[PDB]
Amino acid sequence: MELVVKSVAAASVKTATLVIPVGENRKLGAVAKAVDLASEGAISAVLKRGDLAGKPGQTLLLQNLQGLKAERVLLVGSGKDEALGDRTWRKLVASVAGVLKGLNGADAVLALDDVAVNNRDAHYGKYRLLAETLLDGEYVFDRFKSQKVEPRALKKVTLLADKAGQAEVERAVKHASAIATGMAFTRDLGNLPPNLCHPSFLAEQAKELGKAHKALKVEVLDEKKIKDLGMGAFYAVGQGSDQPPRLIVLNYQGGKKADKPFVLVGKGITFDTGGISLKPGAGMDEMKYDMCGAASVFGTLRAVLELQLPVNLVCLLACAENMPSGGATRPGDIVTTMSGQTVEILNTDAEGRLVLCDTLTYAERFKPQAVIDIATLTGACIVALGSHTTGLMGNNDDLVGQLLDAGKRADDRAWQLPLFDEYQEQLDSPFADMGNIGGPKAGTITAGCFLSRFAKAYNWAHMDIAGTAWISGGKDKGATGRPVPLLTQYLLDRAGA
Amino acid sequence: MELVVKSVAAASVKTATLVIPVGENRKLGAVAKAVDLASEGAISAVLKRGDLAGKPGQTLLLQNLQGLKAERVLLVGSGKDEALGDRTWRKLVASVAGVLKGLNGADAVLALDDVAVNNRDAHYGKYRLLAETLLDGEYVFDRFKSQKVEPRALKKVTLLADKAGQAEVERAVKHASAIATGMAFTRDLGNLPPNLCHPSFLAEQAKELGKAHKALKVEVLDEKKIKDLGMGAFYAVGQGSDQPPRLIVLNYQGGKKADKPFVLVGKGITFDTGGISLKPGAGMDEMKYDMCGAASVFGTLRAVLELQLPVNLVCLLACAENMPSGGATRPGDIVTTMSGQTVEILNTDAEGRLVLCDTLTYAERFKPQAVIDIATLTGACIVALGSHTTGLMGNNDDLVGQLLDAGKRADDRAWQLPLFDEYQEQLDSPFADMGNIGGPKAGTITAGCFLSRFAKAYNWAHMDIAGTAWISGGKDKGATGRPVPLLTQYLLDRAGA
Amino acid sequence: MELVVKSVAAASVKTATLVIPVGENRKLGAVAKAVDLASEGAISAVLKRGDLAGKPGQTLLLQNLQGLKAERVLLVGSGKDEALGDRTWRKLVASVAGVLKGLNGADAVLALDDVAVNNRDAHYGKYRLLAETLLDGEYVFDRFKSQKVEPRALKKVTLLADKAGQAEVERAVKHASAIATGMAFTRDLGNLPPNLCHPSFLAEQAKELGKAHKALKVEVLDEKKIKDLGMGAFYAVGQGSDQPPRLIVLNYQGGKKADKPFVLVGKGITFDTGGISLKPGAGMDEMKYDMCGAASVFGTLRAVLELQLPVNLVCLLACAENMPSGGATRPGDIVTTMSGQTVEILNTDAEGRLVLCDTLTYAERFKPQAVIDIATLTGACIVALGSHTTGLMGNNDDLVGQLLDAGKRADDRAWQLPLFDEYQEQLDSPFADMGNIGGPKAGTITAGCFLSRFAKAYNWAHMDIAGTAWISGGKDKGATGRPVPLLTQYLLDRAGA
Ligand SMILES: CC(C)C[C@H](NC(=O)[C@@H](O)[C@H](N)Cc1ccccc1)C(=O)O
Ligand SMILES: CC(C)C[C@H](NC(=O)[C@@H](O)[C@H](N)Cc1ccccc1)C(=O)O
Ligand SMILES: CC(C)C[C@H](NC(=O)[C@@H](O)[C@H](N)Cc1ccccc1)C(=O)O
Ligand SMILES: [K+]
Ligand SMILES: [K+]
Ligand SMILES: [K+]
Ligand SMILES: [Mn+2]
Ligand SMILES: [Mn+2]
Ligand SMILES: [Mn+2]
Ligand SMILES: [Zn+2]
Ligand SMILES: [Zn+2]
Ligand SMILES: [Zn+2]
């Protein structure tokens, strides 16, 4: 979809559908009032009949009105006078998009300048949310359908704002477009089934990306290299499968050569059966999303490439497929990690932290200013924070604060959990330097504690996206693309953009 | 056992054991009375003592009686002066057989003409049930025992009937003998353990059968052929095992060249672990019977060959072994079926419908007049219809009705369940054309619905024999041979025999 | 909502909203075409723009059109030019009703004569389904909401038909209105929470209904009466609770004095905890619907009273509340039923068949021509037939067939399951005449088998509505009102109405 910004009057714009807001009690703001006046009162005449109560997202669609250049006018409810919260604003926009998707109009004009959004400026923050919702809402994954989604008529949307706000709306659209393009890439990789989307496939995706971008260099480390580097934990996860593991490095040099890089580490478990500690059958298909950490790193990188941010960004994708077999890791195996710390693998279904720990040690070589790991790590995080909020831990309160602030401004929120030293003992092993599980109490936190033992060389944060990375059921089952908005926001903030 | 029919007087017949019926209140029918008189009232005299109440299947065994040529007389209770139901009649016969098997007599004569069986003619229907119970009751599967069953003395049974009915009893014996010989083959294949009875073994069985019979042509399609035909669902089931899959085609051309064939499709999962969606351990051994669909097709074919029915019969055995491994199918995999329809494999333990759907597409080439699939498909069918009655679904009312009627006449009953369109949606997938599971509601029906999407080219029915194909425990644990009687009866009906 | 029928031309009717169908490819039937012409081609002109593809239930709403007397015109998609199935037709009607409910129009005119419905005549069967969907869709249960549903503007719908069809449409409306009114009563009783809706409450409801209807006499039997009649199974169920049981008799004498009555027996377990055989907590709230058998009998009676059918109808509501306590029935208890047959209560959560068996014996006194029990009886029925189809068993083929045919014509379908004698032994007890459970195989059937032992005196059928009586979750959670349509249709059939 093409998304552009103009400052012309709403009544003057030639379009298939003009969209304007209407409050409860048929209350029209200055923009809608001017459109009503151009229609010689036709809009307020229809509103007087009472079909539209004006609750947020309710709609009334009109056809050709004399005095207007729009072929259709869509009235959308904006609710009571009170400013809208983020969720209500995004639902309003999605309601609009749903109607437009079903029409045979080639373009539409949104004239929603009068709608106030709580704690967001009328031009940048408000439109960041609208644009991302509109563009991400175009997403289709019909690759495996014999009957394809018939393409939609809607090819273009124009946002109307005042002259003074136009540049800021354009900046919101630029940023939202990069984020939505990155999210589409994330969502495609998440939604791909695990018989196709395995570690070698992700390596090929990375190599393709490297060829397409001059400032990107890609290196792929195979199973032998992982083993030779001393990555005993990463190797142990992957060995059970016929699909070998891959550590994928994507190095974007957008900053000055001397600038310390930001490192994103993504968990790329392409399918998590649990291994010998096998999962139950119910809902196991959703473990194709266990590479959503790696997918979100791909999508964040793709947003960064689109924006050409002037930062050095090193992406490390720790990819393996966790399968039961006659050569799989067993509960009770002890391995030596790249750091030299030994790990007793008490449960082979706590495998993400194993590929991550070795990759955290690998990251030391880049001499980073921040290392953020993203992983669908714990069912415990869904118990703690549910579907709405990513769990966040780290070893630097300034980094943790920056990620929280980015998630608030991006409306892709996270929430800090503590890594108090008292939780560490839960990982104690009588045999090895640590075990890989902490028991049934504080599961999200003990997984963060385990990772923290490998992150002492740098400023580090860990994002547990087990609850935010996909929707489990209903019509909308599938990858969400989170946390691409938070991560991209954090990088925009570090770039000063 | 040799089973013959004669029309001589019971008192006159030289035999190790003469069997005659006695009612309650010591009441003797015409046949029994004649034997009593020949015995000089000896039988009445013993009855007066009251040891035999005459309830169905009760017995009293006499030794040499003056005036008879029989060495022993077995009296068997026939109940009150009303006709017996099928179950009571078959139990009476089994009771008699159990006594004879324990004796050292080389033959026996059954003189049970006076016993009425409800809704069964005195010559054909009555003796179809008797002869099949007698012959199937001889079944022994002692090949894995170090101590073999002491072979039995009983080598021959003669059924006495009146002259007028002799040919119809002979026709019942001909048909029952073919059915029982088919059932023995089915039972042996089901009872064989899965380390021996794998898809390659079944292929060798088919090849051996092909060499033994001129009107039979056998082709075996291996794993690469299955893959190269585009059978993505069948291939997915078999990949996880070290034993590769086989699609076995047995083509019997007994009809006219231009007569459309009847196609039988059998599920041949030689062991069902569930795969990655692994089953619980308890009772898993009974999943060696997950090839009883394919076994019943082999047994029906053996009966048809014995009878030389004048029909074209194509048998398709879809054989694979469902194992967990590092190369097995995962929940969430999406495959392209031979038909081009895509399937999301949400649960790798819903595997029978996957090998079946591709085999249903394969069956289109034969331009059949009926396609019947037989499969141990759903635990839900045991919840719905239990151990007694096979679940039946289809896309043609006439075919379904023919199979029901065959089951009633063969005393191997089925019962229809509806494939209403409302159940289809339970198979919807957001990614593929369908998923392979429908959830906890209507599981037998949604499996039928899944298969129906591959059967639209022809008249089709599906038989879920999960409850009727074997007995789980007790002294009689093992394959039953069902539904060989129903299927054979259906083909006798189509042949006009 | 008032529902009336007229034979005036669609373009001529003064109304807030005129509803007409449009096919795919903008194809207009005779009625829609005549409206288009009166609108001076306005409707064709809007359709040419392509916003409405015409798939069943899609909508496009127009405002005031020159040449018409309708204030609004709703175009509704009717699909390709083939007849619609029942489900598609009812979903089309619900789509229309949804739009109308959100408008501020006091009335609407449905001009849907053009639309063909498969296997149902243009006037009676087609409009039975439309009228019931429209009227049942008006249902609101907001008693426990602090914020009430806003009263809807829509008060009247007019159906247009040709003069020749008017009588038959009016008959359909009369019957659908009775059915919908009965369903609303059923749904209210089902949706009441169990702290309010207990057996004494249902007894009050029945007494109040008796006072309002001349031809209705109501008797209520309390716990002591149930005990004193020798109803040891019914008494055993209710004894654990602080709410005592009630057996409610509602006798409608609408037939000739010497006509044998139809008896409906409803399970009225107002809450089923399982008792000492306690249920799991998950979903237990839905056991407030365990009196939906009884609720559907009240609803059917309400429909019969509205229609004044000329039949004698005796309703027996077997009401109890199944609770654990220090005085509750135990697994292993043996009780003497009213019939004198003893029952070993192996599981106290098989309680509905216990209150039903004693009520089936009580029904003998009426010398009925048919006895139908309706009960939310088995989870196994949901496994067998899911949410779409009621399970049906019986001891009379004619009665079973009549109920099946009623279900088809009412679009409230049932499906027969067999009560073969082989399933009876599953109920054997070493101690009593029978146990109340048959094990994990054929649960729906063994429950019907249990009941059949109490129904030998008369023609009897059993409806297991465990899957059809309510919706478990989502926006539409709550009672369905089924099987009031099937039961009312059966009584219409017996009355000759
Ligand atoms: C063994 C445990 C300590 C850890 C275990 N974690 C895992 O299995 C992770 O690898 C899972 N990928 C976490 C998960 C499970 C379900 C939904 C979303 C995310 C878990 O159950 O949380
Ligand atoms: C995963 C489910 C949708 C289907 C699943 N079906 C199976 O596993 C079939 O392959 C089984 N072969 C069915 C079965 C299980 C136990 C006894 C007899 C038959 C079942 O549990 O019924
Ligand atoms: C103990 C078993 C033989 C019978 C048991 N039946 C019951 O508990 C019935 O009283 C329940 N009212 C049946 C039920 C359970 C869940 C949803 C709908 C209907 C059941 O589990 O089906
Ligand atoms: K994936
Ligand atoms: K076997
Ligand atoms: K209730
Ligand atoms: Mn895991
Ligand atoms: Mn299986
Ligand atoms: Mn219960
Ligand atoms: Zn994982
Ligand atoms: Zn199976
Ligand atoms: Zn109950």
- In Å, what is the CA distance from B34 to each residue of B15, B310, C441? 17, 43, 47
H or E stretch at A397: helix A397-410
Residue A470: both structure tokens together: 């996909």
Element (H, E) at B177: helix B166-191
Mutate to test the pocket of ligand 2, among B271, B349, B436, B470 (most ligand atoms within 8 A of CB): B349
The ligand that comes nearest to the alpha carbon of residue B386 is 2
Out of B324, B332, B432, whose CB is closest to A194?
Answer: B332
CB-based contact (8 Å) between A473 and chain B?
no
CA of A259 to the centre of ligand 12 (A): 71
In DSSP terms, which residues pair with A70 in a beta bridge?
A: A15
Token couple for A437: 């599980």
Nearest to A61 among C61, C103, C104 (CB): C61
- Contact by Cβ (8 Å): B216, B306: no
Can you tell me the distance from the alpha carbon of C14 to that of C6, in angstroms, rounded to the nearest whole number? Answer: 12
d(CA B349, CA B367): 31
Beta bridge partners of B150: none
- Residues with Cβ within 8 Å of B383's Cβ and at least 6 positions away in sequence, in order, are B443, C380, C383, C384, C440, C441, C442, C443
Name every residue whose Cβ is closer than 8 Å to that of residue A235 and which is 6 or more positions away in sequence: A223, A226, A227, A245, A335
Resolution (A): 1.5
A351 is known to lie in a ligand binding site: yes
Q: Which of A25, A63, A107 to mutate to test the interface with C (most CBs of C within 10 A)?
A: A63
Pairing mode of beta strands B342-345, B370-375: unpaired
Tell which residue, A316, A301, A304, has the closest CA to residue A373: A316
Residue A277 CA, closest ligand 1 atom number: 1
Contact by Cβ (8 Å): C22, C47: yes
Enter the CATH code of domain A178-496: 3.40.630.10
Residue with structure tokens 């159906």? C159
Which of C444, C401, C383 has its CA nearest to residue B464?
C383
Q: Collapse the DSSP code of C36 into the 3-class scheme (helix H, G, I; strand E, B; otherwise coil) and give the result.
A: helix
- For the CA atoms of B419, B421, B423, B427, the dihedral, rounded to the nearest 10 degrees, stands at 110
Query: Nearest 5 degrees, angle CA C424-CA C425-CA C431?
Result: 115
Does the distance separating the beta carbons of B334 and A144 come in below 8 Å?
A: yes
**A146/B340 Cβ within 8 A:** yes
Cα distance between residue B310 and residue B323, in whole Å? 40
Q: 3-state class of B269 per DSSP?
A: strand
Q: How far, in Å, CA of B426 to CA of B422, rounded?
A: 8
Residue C211: Cβ within 10 Å count? 8
Neighbors of chain B with 3 or more C-beta pairs under 8 Å: A, C
At C29, is the secondary structure helix, strand, or coil?
Answer: coil
Q: Which residues 6+ apart lie within 8 Å of A367 measured at CB?
A: A260, A261
Closest CA to B39 of B15, B8, B10: B10
| Residues contacting residue C87 through CB under 8 Å, at least 6 positions apart | B421, B422
Neighbours of A337 (CB within 10 A): 25
* Nearest C-alpha neighbor of A296 from the set A431, A480, A427: A480
| Token pair recorded at residue B128 | 């179809």
Amino acid at B345: I
Helix or strand (DSSP H, E) at A393: strand A390-394
- For A395-429, b where at least 16 C-beta lie within 10 A, e where not — what string? beeebbebbbebbebbbbbbeebebeeebbebbee
Neighbouring C-beta atoms of residue C174, cutoff 10 Å: 15
Cβ A74 vs Cβ A100: under 8 Å: yes
ω into A245 cis (within 30 of 0): no
Ligand 1 pocket test target in A349, A353, A382 with most atoms within 8 Å of CB: A349
User: Among partner residues C49, C51, C103, which is closest to A51 by beta-carbon distance?
Assistant: C103
What are the tokens at B447? 């499996």
Q: Which helix (H) or strand (E) holds B226?
A: helix B223-228
Give C 444-463 residues with CB within 8 A of chain B: 444-446
Containing H/E element for A450? helix A443-452
Spatial CB neighbours of A439, under 8 Å, sequence gap ≥ 6: A426, A446
| Contact partners, residue A135, CB within 8 Å, separation at least 6 | A1, A3, A176, A177, A180, A181
What contacts B28, CB < 8 A, 6 or more positions away? B22, B36, B43, B44
Q: Do residues B111 and B77 make contact, with C-beta atoms less than 8 angstroms apart?
A: no
* Secondary structure tally for chain A: helices H, strands E: 14, 19
**Alpha-carbon distances of B198 from A29, B205, B314, rounded to whole Å:** 76, 11, 22
Residue that has been written with the tokens 């021509």 in this structure: C369
Task: Give the span between the Cα atoms of C19 and A149, in whole angstroms.
Answer: 29
Count of beta carbons in the 10 Å neighbourhood of residue C433: 17
Question: Can you say whether the dihedral through the CA atoms of C185, C188, C193, C196 is positive or negative?
Answer: negative
Domain C1-161: what homologous superfamily? Leucine Aminopeptidase, subunit E, domain 1 (3.40.220.10)
Dist CA A297 CA A175 (whole Å): 17
Choose among B274, B323, B276, B321: nearest CA to B294. Answer: B321
List alpha helices for A192-311, DSSP H. 199-212, 223-228, 232-238, 292-307
SS3 B435: strand
Cα–Cα nearest to B462, from B474, B471, B453: B453
Residue A249 β-bridge partners: A219, A316
For residue B394, with 0-12 CB atoms within 10 Å meaning exposed, 13-18 middle and 19 or more buried, which class applies? Answer: buried
Q: Which one, of A197, A198, A188, lies nearest residue A320 by Cα? A: A198
Ligand nearest to the CA of B332: 4
Determine the Cα–Cα distance for residues B405 and C181; give it in Å rounded to an integer.
Answer: 43
- For chain C, the structural domain boundaries read 1-161, 178-496
Mutation to test the B interface, candidates C88, C377, C385, C413, most B Cβ within 10 Å: C385
- Cβ distance B342 to A146 less than 8 Å, yes or no, reads yes
CB atoms within 10 A of CB B13: 18
Sheet order of strands, B434-435 included: B333-336, B342-345, B434-435
Task: Rounding to the nearest 10 degrees, give the CA dihedral for residues C427, C431, C432, C438.
Answer: -10
Residues in chain C: 497
Which stretches does DSSP call E strand in C27-144? 59-63, 72-77, 107-110
Residues whose beta carbon lies within 6 Å of some atom of ligand 1: A 272, 290, 347, 349-352, 376-380, 437, 443, 466
Residue nearest to atom 21 of ligand 1 (CA): A379
* Consecutive H or E run containing B266: strand B262-272
Q: How far does the centroid of ligand 4 lie from the alpha carbon of residue A365, in Å?
A: 29
DSSP character at residue B117: B
Q: What are the structure tokens assigned to B15, written together?
A: 């035999």
Tokens 């009235």 correspond to what residue?
Answer: A75
Are residues A248 and A203 in contact, defined by beta-carbon separation less than 8 angstroms? Answer: yes
> Left, alpha or beta for B141 (phi > 0: left; psi -120 to 50: alpha)?
beta
The per-type count for chain B, helices as H runs and strands as E runs, is 15, 19
Q: List the determination method.
A: X-ray
* Cis peptide bond N-terminal to C430, omega within 30: no
Alpha-carbon distance B97 to B124, whole Å?
A: 20
B440 in contact with chain A, both atoms CB, cutoff 8 A: no
Q: Which of C378, C462, C482 to mutate to test the pocket of ligand 3 (most atoms within 8 A of CB)?
A: C378
DSSP, residue by residue, C276-338: TSPPPSTTGGGGGGGGHHHHHHHHHHHHHHHHT-SSEEEEEEEEEEE--STTS--TTEEEE-T
Nearest chain C residue to B423, by CA: C388
Name C326's Cβ contacts closer than 8 Å, sequence gap at least 6: none
Sort strands C390-394 and C460-464 into parallel, antiparallel or unpaired: antiparallel
Cβ neighbors of C365 (< 8 A, separation 6 or more) are none
Euclidean distance between CA atoms C357 and A6, whole angstroms? 77
Q: Which token pair is C364?
A: 């003998």
Cα angle B486-B490-B493, degrees, rounded to a multiple of 5: 135
Q: Which residues of C participate in catalysis according to the annotation? A: 279, 353
**Is A91 within any annotated ligand binding site?**
no
Amino acid at B170: E
**Integer Cα distance of A111 and A131 in angstroms:** 13
Say whether B61 sits in a helix, a strand or coil: strand
For residue A241, the chain B residues in CB contact (below 8 A) are 326-327
Q: Please, which residues 104-133 of chain C have a Cβ atom closer than 8 Å to chain B? A: none
Contact A114, A153 (CB under 8 A): no
Structure tokens at A415: 């929430």
The β-bridge relationship of strands C156-160 and C2-6 is parallel
| Angle at C113 (CA atoms; ends C111, C115), nearest 5 degrees | 110
DSSP letter assigned to residue B438: -
Q: Which of B388, B413, B470 to mutate to test the interface with C (most CBs of C within 10 A)?
A: B388
**Rg for chain C, CA atoms, rounded:** 25
**Dihedral, CA atoms, A425, A429, A434, A438, nearest 10 degrees?**
-50
- Beta strand residue intervals within A222-361, DSSP E: 246-253, 262-272, 312-322, 333-336, 342-345
List the beta bridge partners of residue C437.
none
Q: Is A295 in contact with A247 (CB distance < 8 Å)?
A: no
String of DSSP letters for A7-70: -S-GGG--EEEEEEEEEGGG---HHHHHHHHHTTTHHHHHHHT------TT-EEEEE--TT-SE
Q: What token pair was written down for C361?
A: 């014996």
A263: left (phi over 0), alpha (psi -120 to 50) or beta: beta
Bridge partners of A317, per DSSP, are: A248, A266
Please tell me the distance from the alpha carbon of residue B28 to that of residue B454, in angstroms, as a whole number.
Answer: 58
